[PDB]
Design a protein around this ligand. Structure first.
Ligand SMILES: CCc1cc(O)ccc1-c1ccc2c(C(N)=O)n[nH]c2c1
Length: 292
């Protein structure tokens, strides 16, 4: 119901950058009196026909979503042609859950951690009904609205399942977050609802270590690979470690019932991992049992 144009978009400050794109804070101001609404804006640095095509698919996915725990779509800008396309989304002042939690950690207890966990489960349950696979679940990619609510973000790798099958195979892997990936994703490039469940397991580990740098997944796995070899790639060493049942340890002070959920999510067999339905019920019941 509304298209945006270049001449009313005003730069305020930087929010982030990668190898192919960047994000900015701007004010849309068509009356030119500085009363306009503040928004967040994405654009591409290096436009290859391939990357430009992936960008337009990201936008169609975002249009179709409406849920309390998922980030809101606003519009698009074609003022300078297809090769200079921009995306407009809602601005959330508190930023990412990774950044927020490091800052305000002395006011966040085990009960609060489980509130965030529950809301993430509800969001993924909704994506499942549309047959979408997220592919990039991590605390850097969740956003905060206020002290009692969070939403799922960055949909830049998301895919749709075929009508006939229960997995999608990706042609040409990109630059990947290997320390959050399932084994059959690493060896065969297969992604599914089940591989999203392995990733949710690692998010729960991030939360109960309070996002400390020195206990992060990259730090722990590199420690476990060791000091010697010598002769192989880093990803080759990781695939071998996982085949022989090596896993991340229990965080200091983690409850029995929460640690059991982690171990179940990290099963080698895809057919033996739990559902997002059951995960929501179990988490809510544990939170109630701490209440009284
Ligand atoms: C436009 C980029 C984007 C793309 C996507 O697919 C999902 C979410 C975002 C996004 C990223 C960051 C923020 C922020 C902040 N404060 O950093 N606020 N709203 C944001 C939305």
């Amino acid at each position: 119901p509304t298209q945006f144009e270049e001449r009313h978009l005003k730069f305020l400050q930087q929010l982030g950058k990668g190898n192919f794109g960047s994000v900015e804070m701007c004010r849309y101001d068509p009356l030119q009196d500085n009363t306009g609404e503040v928004v967040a804006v994405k654009k591409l640095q290096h436009s290859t026909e391939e990357h430009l095509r992936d960008f337009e698919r990201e936008i169609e996915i975002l249009k179709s979503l409406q849920h309390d725990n998922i980030v809101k779509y606003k519009g698009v800008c074609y003022s300078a042609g297809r090769r200079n396309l921009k995306l407009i989304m809602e601005y959330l002042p508190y930023g990412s859950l990774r950044d927020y939690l490091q800052k305000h950690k002395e006011r966040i207890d085990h009960i609060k951690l489980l509130q965030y966990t529950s809301q993430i489960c509800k969001g993924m349950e909704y994506l499942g009904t549309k047959r979408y696979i997220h592919r990039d679940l991590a605390t850097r990619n969740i956003l905060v609205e206020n002290e009692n609510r969070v939403k799922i973000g960055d949909f830049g790798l998301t895919k749709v399942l075929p009508q006939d099958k229960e997995y999608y195979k990706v042609k040409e892997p990109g630059e990947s977050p290997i320390f959050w990936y399932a084994p059959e994703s690493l060896t065969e490039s297969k992604f599914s609802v089940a591989s999203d469940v392995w990733s949710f397991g690692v998010v729960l580990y991030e939360l109960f270590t309070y996002i400390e740098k020195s206990k992060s997944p990259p730090a722990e796995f590199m420690r476990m690979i060791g000091n010697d070899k010598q002769g192989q790639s880093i990803v080759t060493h990781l695939i071998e470690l996982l085949k022989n049942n090596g896993r991340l340890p229990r965080p200091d002070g983690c409850p029995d019932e929460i640690y059991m959920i982690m171990t179940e999510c990290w099963n080698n067999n895809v057919n033996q991992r739990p559902s997002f339905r059951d995960l929501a019920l179990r988490v809510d019941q544990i939170r109630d049992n701490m209440a009284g």
